[PDB]
Paper text:
The asymmetric reconstruction of the native particle of RcGTA has an overall resolution of 4.3 Å, and symmetrized reconstructions of the head, portal complex, tail, and baseplate have resolutions of 3.3–4.5Å. Asymmetric reconstruction of the RcGTA particle at a resolution of 4.3 Å enabled characterization of the interface between the capsid and portal complex. Incorporation of the portal complex into the capsid is enabled by changes in the structure of the major capsid proteins relative to their structures in the rest of the capsid. Residues 99–106 from the N-termini of major capsid proteins interacting with the portal are tilted 18° away from the portal complex relative to their orientation in other capsid proteins. This conformational change enables the N-terminus to fit inside a groove formed by the wing domain of the portal complex and peripheral domain and extended loop of the capsid protein. The asymmetric reconstruction of the RcGTA particle shows that interactions of the capsid with portal and adaptor complexes induce deviations of the structures from their ideal fivefold and twelvefold symmetries, respectively. By contrast, an asymmetric reconstruction of the portal and adaptor complexes of RcGTA, determined to a resolution of 4.3 Å, does not show any unique interactions between the portal or adaptor proteins and the packaged DNA. Therefore, the DNA is probably held in the RcGTA head by the tape measure proteins and iris-like constriction within the baseplate, which block the tail channel. Furthermore, the end of the DNA packaged in the native RcGTA particle extends through the channel formed by the hexamer of stopper proteins and continues into the disc of tail terminator proteins.
Author numbering:
A (entry chain A5): 146 to 385
B (entry chain B5): 109 to 179, 186 to 385
C (entry chain 2L), F (entry chain 2A): 1 to 171, 175 to 197
D (entry chain 1B), E (entry chain 1C): 24 to 78, 89 to 393
Write the structure that this text describes.
């Protein structure tokens, strides 16, 4: 407050301190391998199962980071109590509406993009990015002008410019596609807007003693995640 | 490390004239009019042509205060000092733009604006866009370019636009009859930061596009707006008053209004 | 942590007609109802005595647990022990707005530790300067027949005593009032920080 | 290096790796908090700065920057290695060769970046929300990163204070036990019990001010020590004691004060802690100090300055401690000069080459 | 340097940074309060003033100003470094080179200003509410700022008293425990209990003056020690004791009296505190004192006077401790002269060059 | 800290018609003869004996807590335990200007330790000489029926005792007067500086 001379200034509000908890859930796979099949074959089965487990976990937790609920798995940002931007509060994430219910708005496509970029807020756009799946970026490139040329990477050759409105694009295939109310495009500073807590190892272990004709591998990693800063992620609602 | 919400930092401080002052006020001295010299006649009296009436505008140098109570993982002294400096950098930004007279610097929007072409000294000049809701429908950006070219060639050597984020949004939403984005043509460009050859300052305390709001300003604020201040920040690390809460006392004193009424031109979204 | 009751017991759920059989009043008199106003006054005075010594509930009336800061980071053990189906953890704000929250909290039923443990490793946060009231219905059953009978007997051993002596006049059983209560009291040995 | 690419991806290339959170709090609770952790680092960092060096390059080391001398630099450098296991040295090069500025960047606010091949590409000096992103994708590599040995971590050091972090909190809290015991304790030297005719009875404020004035004047103080103190009916004086008087966690503090000195490697005789005589007569304990925890530390840091600073020069330079005219090693110098000086069989120039003299 | 420019704008450029809050209260409670903290600073500050120096400029140091001699200057200078981690020296320069005034500015009333690029631009001497604002935006830079090593702070020192601030409050309050125990304590040497026929009964003031006068005359004092003391019916003598007699926090004070001496680095033998024999015979403990906490401290301040005062001269001057004819290092001088003097193999002029002699 | 009551009970809030039934209903001489206003004078004597041993209030009377200096920095535990809704925290100065405050504090209700617990660390400071003064309404409910019935029975076990025998005459019940009170007493273990 601007302090007057004859005011005898009162104390002001100490800012509330929030404490948001990462639950840090577990993620494990237990493949059952035969002992004879592991002893006879020419392929390195203990290596191949490790490769497939390490491929599976980095995709299962990738879908958890986007669309997982709070309980039993890390919660993704798209599951959180979102509100229209302008009506924004801390206990939510902001969206902007695109216009038409099916797709982008007919009279001005990408106009739903260029206002979300400037609705995110100027401080988090220092290092921000877009997040989409593949067939949303397809529909983004299919946005054309009145003539028929492309708004983004104008020439029909030399595609994927890795730069949308000055900010990078992450093709994360675990977002919903374009639908009646689905949120296909997300934008913001996810380095400050989403915290991942994890135990950074893939512990893998054989124990034939559980199932005795078999080997029964078991690999496990635990990752937890939620939003750190609610003011750093905005979304596109394809509704109104 | 404790986090916080990241607020806007751009504050009109880096484009206005920052003057270190030590007294209670800062008096700028501007003449209101011209010499009025005429071409002399060969047989005439020729005396007392005129004299510029000077005017003292007073920067009152108000003070700003925020008083939080403190009430070993993260250390409060450094963190609260890094939050209250941000709040003093952001709360003076609102006063520099739309502050009123009482106890705070009067921003450049609160200076009784008069339509340009009937411009006098005691006010700021604006240019109208057209329809009241937004930019003109037939020719967008004509309001922007004649806002630029209705200012004066001496101040346009180093002048800048002042908007918030969602007015620069509505500027970048301008498109031709094919829809090709007059400003930063592709979807791969970004913020071009050189509108009409001049820089853009995204200051969030500007109003947005409304029925009569002055959402776009343009000017050489180095001559226009004078921020007179004292550079330090008071730090009363108070160990009294309340045993439970430290109740740190931090204050910076700062003042400012417009020094030159010709430098700043506004865009009124009306007829 | 205030822990008031939303609704009391109906009174018609109390076994006044069976407590009268206990106290040996009389069988076939035409009056039969001169004590009804006072017999349930001692049954409510003996249940509420055993509800405090055992921290049990016994009629499954609805409660309201209005508290502000969580006792431990995630657990929040409830005081009234035999619980079922916590209705609402509506999170009030500093002033006014009451937003009920599904919030990803669970309920761990137990007669000893009726926790409300959260699944996301942190219960829903609390707006600074605002309370978090929890509506829950805790007790054994709705009617008197759904009780453990030894605890129901400890009401009848106790409310018969208040009926037979009015003021504090002094007057050893194998399973008395106290020895029936003691398997329903809360056995705690923590005086610590956590 | 061939396996370098595999560990880099797991951590995540291009992203800062922080390591230990609580590093800044061990400084305030273990180095600004207790004297044993304070003296142990100050005893070492003022010892490694005093040791001369053997090579030009040392002209930079003699005057690194403004307001931060040669001896003041290594106190800042080793004082970060003992505290947080990591040493950092920014070099500012206005000139192409032998950059004329050195700055010890504190290791609280520095973070590594793993990069592509596992060896680092970025260092991030992070003050407030502000980063810098120093770059290691070049030949001069502007920051030398001195690691203490850490077997489990791939990017930082171990910081001996972390290994003694339990024994610091014993010594901090046992010392604060006796402080708050001297500040929260009610011992009385007695109690004048007044029961009365009943089991309970107060005495009137007339009688109570009488009881103070005969206690204030005639019984308290040094000068009234031992008055015979008539007690009438009802009154009685029960003298209280204070049964643990000395020695509140006295040996567990004195044992934790030695385990802190154990981890940094100082002997108990140098720092001044009490304890059993292990070393004898300071010709040993000062020689043991500059041989088990100073000169191995200094020859490891000087070996990193011998390689990082030679990357700015053309020719590589060696840079080692002197291990000569350091006056704590005189018992190893008497013992080696009197051995060869008494060997009269071999000639004069044959022992000048042994003791290190230029022969004549 | 580059990191510093970022660090400034976090704290705030152009505004004073104060640092320690309690450093004005640790002086009164830790240097004017207890003898151990008093003697420890006086033992060091009177030792650094006694050490000669090796270079004109020293003519300034010999006579800095009126009423403040050479030895009195370093007692004031080191006495601020040991107390508050910071040393200050104002120079008044009527003349361009070698300014003829030095003044130890006390570090309670001095505050730094970070300035633009992180390295300081202002120092603010604040007494009352009145300031001075010394300026560092020039070449001579009129204040040398000697920092003790502080790992967490960027502008001040650590001040070993801050590290011993728990052991000061133990030693201050345990010593004040025994003071107020000798001043607030009622011990009686007995109690003549008079019950009576009832459980309670007073005795009349006729009987009571009889009871005083037979106690005043015949029973108290040295000369009446042990009279057989007939007790009739009703009377009874209960002798009281005093169960903790000696030793009220005697070892916890003596352990805290050693931790204060530990933090400043003085040995327990020099200051005079009791304790187990660590050093032997004062040829070591005085030699340890001038090698672990005096000469490293003195070579660090003298390295800052060698650079700050050379900014007033044209040519740079070195200024180091003598490390010769300081009589605590005579055991390091016997040991080095008898080693090379007994080495008869190398010739006469070959050992005058080793011992530091002018060759012949 | 005077802590005088603003208003007492009305007297018509007390269960005199019910206490006649706890005295002799269902068994007895008849309704008999009891000085009605005498029976009101023993209920006010038994409540004021249990209001003192439990530090509760039981009728929800209005209080005025006028104390000079704040004990803690911010906490200010209120003595009369079951509280609701501070009426006003008006602050008088040494002359009597009586300037109330309306924000800066949030009463945190609780049956154990009711507090004032201002926001942050700043609780309204005291004018030198000008005592602070807090008006609050403390107690369970406005009528007698809103009480915990075990505490209400401790009044009836005690007020009947003052009715049955007048002087201090001699006379170990399981849930007597004392056993019904002990779960409402204040359990404190601080004798220290905070």
């Amino acid at each position: 407050g601007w302090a007057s001379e004859t005011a005898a200034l009162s104390e002001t509000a100490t800012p509330q301190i929030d404490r948001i908890t990462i639950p840090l859930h577990e993620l494990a796979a237990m493949p059952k391998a035969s002992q004879r099949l592991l002893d006879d074959s020419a392929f390195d089965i203990e290596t191949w199962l490790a490769n497939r487990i390490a491929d599976k976990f980095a995709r299962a937790e990738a879908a958890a980071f986007i669309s997982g609920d709070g309980v039993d798995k890390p919660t993704g940002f798209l599951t959180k109590t979102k509100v229209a931007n302008g009506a924004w509060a801390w206990g939510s994430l902001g969206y902007v509406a695109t216009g038409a219910a099916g797709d982008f708005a007919a009279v001005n496509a990408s106009d739903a993009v260029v206002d979300l970029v400037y609705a995110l807020g100027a401080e988090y756009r220092a290092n921000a990015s877009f997040v989409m799946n593949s067939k949303t970026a397809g529909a983004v490139r299919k946005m054309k002008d009145a003539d028929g040329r492309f708004l983004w990477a104008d020439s029909l050759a030399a595609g994927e410019p890795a730069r949308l409105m000055g900010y990078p694009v992450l093709i994360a295939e675990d977002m919903p596609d374009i639908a009646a109310n689905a949120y296909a495009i997300a934008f913001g500073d996810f380095g400050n807007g989403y915290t991942i807590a994890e135990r950074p190892d893939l512990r893998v272990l054989r124990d034939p003693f559980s199932a005795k004709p078999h080997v029964l591998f078991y690999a496990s990693k635990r990752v937890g995640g939620d939003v750190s800063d609610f003011a750093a992620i905005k979304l596109l609602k394809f509704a109104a | 490390t404790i986090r916080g919400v990241l607020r806007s930092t751009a504050s009109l401080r880096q484009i206005a004239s920052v003057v270190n002052v030590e007294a209670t006020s800062f008096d700028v001295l501007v003449d209101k009019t011209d010499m009025g010299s005429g071409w002399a006649s060969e047989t005439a009296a020729l005396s007392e042509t005129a004299t510029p009436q000077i005017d003292r505008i007073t920067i009152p140098l108000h003070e700003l205060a925020a008083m939080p109570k403190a009430s070993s993982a993260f250390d409060i002294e450094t963190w609260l000092a890094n939050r209250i400096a941000d709040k003093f950098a952001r709360a003076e930004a609102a006063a520099f733009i739309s502050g009123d007279g009482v106890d705070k610097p009067t921003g450049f929007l609160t200076k009784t604006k008069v339509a340009n072409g009937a411009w006098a000294w005691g006010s700021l000049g604006y240019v109208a866009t057209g329809a009241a809701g937004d930019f003109a429908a037939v020719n967008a950006s004509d309001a922007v370019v004649d806002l630029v070219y209705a200012l004066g060639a001496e101040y346009r050597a180093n002048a800048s636009f002042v908007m918030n984020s969602k007015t620069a949004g509505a500027v970048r939403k301008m498109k031709d009859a094919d829809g090709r984005f007059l400003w930063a043509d592709s979807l791969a460009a970004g913020e071009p930061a050189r509108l009409m050859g001049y820089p853009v300052l995204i200051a969030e305390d500007m109003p947005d596009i409304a029925a009569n709001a002055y959402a776009i300003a343009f000017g050489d604020f180095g001559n226009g707006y004078t921020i007179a201040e004292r550079p330090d920040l008071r730090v009363l690390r108070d160990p009294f008053s309340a045993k439970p809460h430290v109740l740190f006392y931090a204050s910076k004193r700062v003042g400012g209004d417009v020094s030159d009424f010709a430098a700043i031109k506004l865009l009124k979204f009306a007829a | 942590m205030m822990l008031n009751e939303v609704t009391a017991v109906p009174g018609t759920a109390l076994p006044v007609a069976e407590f009268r059989d206990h106290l040996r009043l009389g069988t076939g008199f035409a009056d039969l109802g001169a004590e009804d106003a006072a017999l349930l006054s001692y049954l409510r005075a003996a249940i509420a005595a055993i509800e405090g010594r055992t921290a049990k509930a016994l009629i499954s009336r609805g409660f309201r647990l209005a508290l502000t800061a969580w006792r431990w980071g995630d657990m929040q053990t409830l005081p009234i022990a035999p619980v079922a189906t916590v209705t609402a953890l509506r999170l009030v704000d500093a002033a006014g707005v009451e937003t009920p929250v599904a919030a990803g909290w669970r309920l761990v039923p137990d007669m000893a530790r009726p926790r409300i443990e959260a699944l996301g490793a942190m219960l829903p946060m609390i707006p600074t300067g605002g309370r978090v009231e929890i509506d829950f219905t805790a007790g054994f059953g709705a009617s008197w027949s759904a009780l453990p009978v030894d605890l129901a007997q400890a009401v009848f051993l106790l409310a018969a005593q208040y009926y037979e002596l009015r003021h504090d006049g002094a007057a050893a059983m194998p399973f008395g009032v106290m020895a029936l209560i003691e398997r329903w009291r809360t056995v705690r040995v923590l005086g610590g920080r956590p | 290096s061939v396996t370098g690419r595999i560990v880099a991806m797991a951590s995540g290339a291009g992203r800062p790796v922080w390591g230990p959170r609580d590093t800044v709090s061990l400084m305030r609770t273990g180095f600004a908090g207790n004297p044993v952790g304070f003296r142990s680092v100050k005893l070492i960092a003022e010892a490694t700065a005093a040791v001369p060096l053997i090579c030009p390059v040392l002209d930079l080391l003699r005057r690194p920057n403004a307001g931060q001398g040669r001896a003041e630099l290594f106190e800042a450098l080793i004082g970060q290695i003992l505290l947080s296991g990591n040493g950092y040295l920014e070099a500012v090069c206005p000139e192409p060769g032998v950059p004329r500025e050195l700055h010890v960047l504190r290791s609280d606010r520095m973070a590594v970046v793993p990069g592509a091949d596992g060896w680092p590409v970025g260092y991030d000096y992070t003050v407030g929300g502000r980063k810098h992103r120093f770059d290691m994708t070049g030949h001069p590599d502007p920051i030398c990163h001195i690691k203490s040995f850490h077997p489990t971590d791939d990017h930082y050091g171990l910081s001996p204070m972390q290994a003694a972090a339990v024994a610091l909190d014993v010594h901090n809290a046992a010392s604060a036990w006796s402080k708050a015991l001297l500040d929260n304790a009610a011992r009385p030297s007695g109690a004048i019990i007044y029961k009365g005719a009943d089991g309970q009875g107060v005495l009137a404020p007339e009688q109570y001010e009488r009881l103070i004035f005969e206690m204030e004047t005639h019984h308290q103080g040094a000068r009234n020590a031992g008055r015979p103190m008539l007690l009438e009916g009802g009154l009685d004086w029960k003298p209280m004691g204070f049964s643990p008087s000395d020695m509140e966690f006295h040996e567990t503090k004195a044992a934790a004060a030695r385990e802190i000195a154990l981890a940094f490697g100082v002997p108990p005789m140098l720092i001044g802690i009490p304890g059993d005589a292990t070393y004898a007569n300071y010709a040993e304990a000062n020689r043991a100090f500059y041989r088990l925890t100073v000169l191995p530390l200094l020859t490891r840091v000087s070996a990193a300055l011998a390689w990082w600073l030679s990357g700015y020069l053309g020719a590589q330079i060696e840079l080692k401690p002197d291990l000569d005219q350091v006056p704590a090693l005189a018992v190893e110098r008497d013992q080696l000069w009197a051995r060869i000086g008494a060997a009269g069989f071999l000639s004069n120039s044959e022992k000048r080459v042994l003791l290190g003299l230029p022969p004549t």
